[PDB]
């Protein structure tokens, strides 16, 4: 499983993963032991290499002809792919999906060999020792696909609210693998209302993009929270022959004011920070444990999810289109210090993930933000130039949703002029015994009267408290549940009373496996802010926020007229 | 109970505590509960107090008539004690003893308030926010004595191993509580053998301390772990009065890079232990305290450091009936250049170290006295500090070595000053190093670098923590089997680095912290006990007990 | 320390426990290597013996001369004792004190042995494999007493709430060691008030006992959980030699009685809120120190209880002494606890529960706390040779106290035969633990039962033990058994339903702590530990501590 439905049914296709490849690690001189392993898996849950950083090598056959692509979900973190021997393709970052594509292979049995690497040092900027587990293997996904002499490489669809109703936009990129000019049209169906035909030219191995115009959509409903509702936007390329499938909901997400308004309507957020971790899984997650997660974030009164730190599966984002679940999706980034963004490669790998990441993402309704760079050096001038090339990045390809960052840089960032809504990580009762009420408003009142971020939309993203399951004490000292029922109860009761705040991200969903040197500060050297522990086991504040959540819609409805 | 013999045949005295006094907090404009608590007792134990830090009044009634002494063996952390309503007397520091001389008291039932404060602030110098606990209460015992005109306040015995065999020393502190001159004689025996007769005269209100010479005493069998062989010595004034402690035969010195007990070389195998406890704070009676005993016995170790503190005359009594060796250090953890300016550190350290040495000088378990645990060695402030304390230890007792626990790798001063050099290190835990490489670093160091060179060395921690119960392949820190391999790893280390008399294990139980503490101690408690709070082994509990039973008391096998 | 108070002034004591004694096992193939062990003390909780069961050997030396008496507070469970290596003295039984007494032993030095067993077997009857662990070692205090010619064995005062007042009888056994008749008296007061003075007359060697009349005691101010005040009473043997010995006890003014199906205190209706508590702690045993009562004492105090039921077995003095001082009412019982008829005829088995009894009573006598006397919990209430054994037993405790009530906690649900023998009606139920039914139907089953079908009928009645498991720290959203979250639930509804039913003078929680039990229990005891405490057994809070404490702070001590 890929996606919640089916993305093709002209081309040839077929998943190389939810199977079992063979694994090794490398780098010794003697025999190491091959053991069949799941793809999508991590190594480190696998009882020999729990604890293994370094390269190993998944390998498998296939059967394949002529044109073919590899289709890679996610590799963690970095990536070579070999093809009957030969280097054909490499990657970096784990959260983000990439793809090999092969000109006129020969008939028959080809061999697959991946090597994927979690290792750290200098040629990583983004995967560093860090409050969260960087996992080594093949942990999304894999997909075969056999082409002709041309492809839809993908399609993006942009609804617009207009004073009539819904119209809509529709952009195609078409790849040409033939060293001939290449002519046809691409047809394009919204739930089976036609909407366009476009007439494509290509020059040898040109790839290159087609809109359409702006379209009356009379027959389209809204997709939002209470009514999710999709459409599969259906793409056939015909030319003297293939296809691309996706879903789309109508729905509008602008800012206005300190307002963040979906279909026209303040918004208020619910939501969890949530990771991509598990126990038995590590970032692997089958669907059945992603709804698991989700079905409990229901219970909970949640209405929306922000995917700390990194892109997620699209997986995971399809149940939450089909779900009505905000997602606030951002690049892969946790933390880093100016000195980290220096990196010769940090500008490059931010600038990967994010354009992979919106590429692949684009026709999500779930998600209404972009997030870039969290808790990144926001306070220094060279980080302000970082944080400005990526916003840039953005909306170049994506000028309709709103932008953010998380910031934890208290009454000193200088990049809030540059974002649609300001964002804070703020920890009141754990980091700092100060009234949640009071740092609150004092960070509020300084980002009104002393930045450029007065006056723009305002979330919450990250506020809570640590508790380790099953540690209780009659003193409710910190650590134990009953103090986290306390500050967790505090502090929503604060942001949800904070004028000018649309809503607030717990920190954190569950508890997360970390990295060894972060052990100091992080019991169990997992970070253990969950409001369920890492087996999903509701700790005493999850009845608080259930209580919370549950009392309040998605909506202001009752403000000042 | 308040110890493990009788302290008084002669002299009339009653124990106050062991008993339910009336308790509230004060600091409020309304009704407080009175509730009936128990002393000893840290009122962080008792259900509606779990979590208070200020003050408490202690009350009860008690009969007597004329001179009276109220002795307290401990009140977390500074005491005001009032009799019938009339403040009588105050105290600091909530590990030391400390008594009240009332003159000639009406008879009848009085009443007794103790008022006890475990906050914090500028007042209290030793009591910070730290990693351990400052309860509230009175935590240790208290004795009524009804007293004549005179009586003796305390008794030192000092042993010496002559060529020729055992040889003795008394020193005897009697004060007259009247104003008129008075004479008298303190007659003196060592297991019921004749040992000194000493004449006394005393001037008006006097309190004089008067010595014996050395003398023979070939009836004595030596003190040690294999046979810890106890005396009762009692002095008995005549003008009447008398004083009963306890001795032991045993000679402790330190000869180049030996530590020798009775010419013995001695292998440390130790722990360090707080006095706590999740039900008793740092109240633990008997009971308690004999259960420690038996895991840490049951461990291999060989001796305990008072971290960072004295202990209870009862639990020092177990330890001289037990043949374990103390390590007893003066009330400091931690403390930074700036925290020892403060205006009553000095003071504070001062009345520590004189109370502690003078209650415990006859325990032949305490074999070293410590100071200043990890205090600001590498300054010159401290050095100062460190300094003063060595030289009013050595003013109070000449005999027995000295040393203070250091972390200022490669960086402290102060090596010059004490008998032996001592180390606190966390390879494997805080620094991630081979043990036996940063072991070597520092030992060569102090070799080659420091005027502690050619003394003898301990390291006074080492250890890693572990949460009971969290257990997982991955063996990550905090998990207990990266304790089990964290500890392996260290003790194989310290017994193999020649120069190095042992090692005490930090530490014996896990144990509550400041809540300032709570960012780097999961559970707001030091995690490094080898077992939990509860007293259940953790799984390093095995690795422990392999390594010292598998070593004797002695360095029997040394080059010749 | 023994006692809250001082015992004695006059005459000489000192306690030998609170100390380091040799210790070492005897009759096994192993090594028995010698260590030094605390007293008192269990030998499970030292580690080389914390599996063992059979014999171990206790000693130390003391010091005396001429007539000496050394006094068990409790050897767990069968005790021989040896001084200078002859044997002197012999006990069943881990929970009643019991005395060996010397004449003219030589001066100096003695050597003290105890041979303590924790063995089951045919000897022992009360000690079985059972739902609470029988521990061995010296579990309580030993005093060393010097005697004259002549000592009090006991003194036992009784209040009397009369119409002008309070007043008050006191009875003392004396005991002539000598071969010579004795002439004397002995004084008694009450907190410094003048009592009585006995003329004493005694044959050589005899043992007697002297009996004041019904005095007032204008004085007095009375006993209860609010006020609990407590006087000390004083005896002193006065002969030839002057003040020759003494005994100090204290008391409370207070009276119980029960008048149809009430129970009175000094005249007002009581509520019972209460918990069975076992003398069990992982650290501890059965030998748990002052510090450690006082701290169950501050919990069960917090939870909003007023009454403690000593399951299964009779309590320290000194934990008994706590309850006197704090106005805890106490339901003291004999040690005994779900005999089957087969058990209860081991030929032991009614001799050794009389001695049971014998001691219990005349030990405990003067406890204000203890309100009510209970026998052979659980036993076999529902056959004939189970109800010869009920009569002889209460018949027993009335000719040694004709004055507080007595009872058992049944679990002979409608097939109790023994419900005319007591003052009050009690059972044992676990509606929603062990069975399925709501607790109110269950109830009133039970309640209709007795008031239409027994002889127990029209008498006050209690619900001993109710309660449900718990292992600390398993929760789950499915609210399964064993769960904390179940239990909040049972205790919820159990709790609600004995507060509303008409009759019912309060309940006994089942139970205050988690308690080990003996393994031949584990496939029914999780962890094998009886996991029905409020507390579990490092006496920390389970969810279902909230739901006590409101049900029981909700109410107060009298109707
Ligand atoms: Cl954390
Ligand atoms: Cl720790
Ligand atoms: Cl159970």
Same mark, same amino acid.
């Given at each position: 499983?890929?996606?919640?439905?089916?993305?093709?049914?002209?081309?040839?296709?077929?998943?190389?993963?939810?199977?079992?490849?063979?694994?090794?690690?490398?780098?010794?001189?003697? $025999?190491?032991?091959?053991?069949?392993?799941? &793809?999508?898996?991590?190594?480190?849950?696998?009882?020999?290499? &729990?604890?293994?950083?370094?390269?190993?090598?998944?390998?498998?056959?296939?059967?394949?002809?002529?044109?073919?692509?590899?289709?890679?979900?996610?590799?963690?973190?970095?990536?070579?792919?070999?093809?009957?021997?030969?280097?054909?393709?490499?990657?970096?970052?784990?959260?983000?999906?990439?793809?090999?594509?092969?000109?006129?292979?020969?008939?028959?049995?080809?061999?697959?060999?991946?090597?994927?690497?979690?290792?750290?040092?200098?040629? @990583?900027?983004?995967?560093?020792?860090?409050?969260?587990?960087?996992? /080594?293997?093949?942990?999304?996904?894999?997909?075969?696909?056999?082409? /002709?002499?041309?492809?839809?490489?993908?399609?993006?669809?942009?609804?617009?609210? =207009?004073?009539?109703?819904?119209?809509?936009? %529709?952009?195609?990129?078409?790849?040409?693998?033939?060293?001939?000019?290449?002519? #046809?049209?691409?047809?394009?169906?919204?739930?089976?209302?036609?909407?366009?035909?476009?007439?494509?030219?290509?020059?040898?191995?040109?790839?290159?993009?087609?809109?359409?115009?702006?379209?009356?959509?009379?027959?389209?409903?809204?997709?939002?929270?209470?009514?999710?509702?999709?459409?599969?936007?259906? %793409?056939?390329?015909?030319?003297?022959?293939?296809?691309?499938?996706?879903?789309?909901?109508?729905?509008?997400?602008?800012?206005?004011?300190?307002?963040?308004?979906?279909? #026209?309507?303040?918004?208020?957020?619910?939501?969890?920070?949530? !990771?991509?971790?598990?126990?038995?899984?590590?970032?692997?997650?089958?669907?059945?444990?992603?709804?698991?997660?989700?079905?409990?974030?229901?219970?909970?009164? %949640?209405?929306?999810?922000?995917?700390?730190?990194?892109?997620?599966?699209?997986?995971?984002?399809?149940?939450?289109?089909?779900?009505?679940?905000?997602?606030?999706?951002?690049?892969?980034?946790?933390?880093?210090?100016?000195?980290?963004?220096?990196?010769? !490669?940090?500008?490059?790998?931010?600038?990967?993930?994010?354009?992979?990441?919106?590429?692949?993402?684009?026709?999500?309704?779930?998600?209404?933000?972009?997030?870039?760079?969290?808790?990144?050096?926001?306070?220094?001038?060279?980080?302000?130039?970082?944080?400005?090339?990526?916003?840039?990045?953005?909306?170049?390809?994506?000028?309709?949703?709103?932008?953010?960052?998380? @910031?934890?840089?208290?009454?000193?960032?200088?990049?809030? #002029?540059?974002?649609? &809504?300001?964002?804070?990580?703020?920890?009141?009762? *754990?980091?700092?015994?100060?009234?949640?009420?009071?740092?609150?408003?004092?960070?509020?009142? *300084?980002?009104?009267?002393?930045?450029? /971020?007065? #006056?723009?939309?305002?979330?919450?993203?990250?506020?809570?408290? /640590?508790?380790?399951?099953?540690? =209780?004490?009659?003193?409710?000292?910190?650590?134990?549940?009953?103090?986290?029922?306390?500050?967790?109860?505090?502090?929503?009761?604060?942001?949800?009373?904070?004028?000018?705040?649309?809503?607030?991200?717990?920190?954190?969903?569950?508890?997360?496996?970390?990295?060894?040197? *972060?052990?100091?500060?992080?019991?169990?050297?997992?970070?253990?802010?969950?409001?369920?522990?890492?087996?999903?086991?509701?700790?005493?504040?999850? $009845?608080?926020?259930?209580?919370?959540?549950?009392?309040?819609?998605?909506?202001?409805?009752?403000?000042?007229?």
């Amino acid at each position: 499983m890929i996606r919640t439905f089916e993305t093709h049914k002209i081309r040839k296709t077929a998943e190389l993963s939810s199977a079992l490849w063979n694994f090794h690690t490398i780098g010794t001189q003697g $025999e190491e032991a091959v053991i069949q392993a799941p &793809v999508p898996g991590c190594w480190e849950n696998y009882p020999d290499t &729990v604890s293994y950083r370094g390269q190993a090598s998944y390998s498998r056959e296939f059967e394949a002809k002529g044109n073919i692509r590899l289709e890679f979900k996610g590799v963690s973190h970095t990536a070579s792919v070999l093809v009957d021997g030969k280097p054909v393709g490499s990657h970096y970052n784990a959260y983000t999906p990439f793809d090999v594509v092969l000109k006129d292979i020969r008939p028959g049995i080809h061999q697959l060999e991946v090597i994927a690497d979690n290792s750290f040092g200098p040629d @990583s900027a983004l995967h560093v020792p860090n409050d969260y587990q960087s996992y /080594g293997g093949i942990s999304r996904g894999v997909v075969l696909e056999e082409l /002709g002499e041309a492809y839809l490489s993908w399609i993006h669809f942009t609804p617009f609210l =207009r004073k009539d109703g819904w119209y809509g936009k %529709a952009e195609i990129c078409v790849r040409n693998l033939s060293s001939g000019r290449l002519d #046809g049209s691409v047809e394009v169906e919204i739930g089976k209302n036609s909407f366009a035909v476009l007439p494509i030219v290509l020059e040898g191995e040109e790839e290159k993009s087609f809109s359409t115009e702006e379209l009356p959509c009379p027959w389209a409903e809204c997709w939002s929270p209470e009514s999710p509702v999709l459409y599969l936007i259906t %793409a056939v390329l015909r030319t003297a022959a293939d296809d691309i499938i996706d879903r789309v909901g109508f729905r509008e997400i602008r800012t206005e004011g300190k307002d963040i308004l979906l279909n #026209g309507r303040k918004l208020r957020i619910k939501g969890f920070c949530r !990771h991509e971790d598990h126990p038995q899984f590590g970032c692997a997650l089958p669907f059945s444990a992603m709804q698991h997660d989700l079905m409990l974030i229901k219970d909970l009164g %949640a209405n929306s999810i922000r995917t700390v730190h990194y892109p997620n599966d699209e997986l995971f984002l399809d149940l939450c289109d089909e779900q009505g679940i905000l997602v606030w999706e951002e690049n892969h980034a946790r933390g880093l210090s100016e000195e980290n963004m220096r990196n010769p !490669h940090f500008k490059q790998q931010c600038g990967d993930c994010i354009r992979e990441m919106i590429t692949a993402h684009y026709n999500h309704p779930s998600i209404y933000i972009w997030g870039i760079l969290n808790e990144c050096a926001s306070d220094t001038e060279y980080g302000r130039e970082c944080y400005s090339e990526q916003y840039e990045l953005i909306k170049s390809l994506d000028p309709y949703r709103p932008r953010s960052s998380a @910031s934890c840089r208290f009454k000193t960032d200088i990049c809030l #002029g540059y974002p649609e &809504v300001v964002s804070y990580n703020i920890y009141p009762k *754990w980091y700092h015994d100060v009234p949640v009420e009071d740092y609150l408003d004092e960070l509020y009142q *300084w980002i009104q009267n002393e930045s450029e /971020g007065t #006056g723009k939309p305002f979330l919450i993203t990250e506020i809570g408290a /640590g508790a380790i399951y099953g540690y =209780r004490t009659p003193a409710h000292v910190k650590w134990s549940e009953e103090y986290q029922v306390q500050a967790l109860k505090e502090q929503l009761q604060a942001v949800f009373s904070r004028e000018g705040c649309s809503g607030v991200y717990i920190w954190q969903f569950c508890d997360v496996r970390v990295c060894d040197s *972060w052990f100091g500060s992080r019991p169990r050297t997992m970070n253990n802010k969950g409001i369920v522990d890492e087996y999903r086991r509701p700790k005493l504040a999850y $009845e608080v926020v259930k209580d919370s959540y549950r009392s309040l819609g998605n909506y202001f409805e009752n403000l000042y007229f």
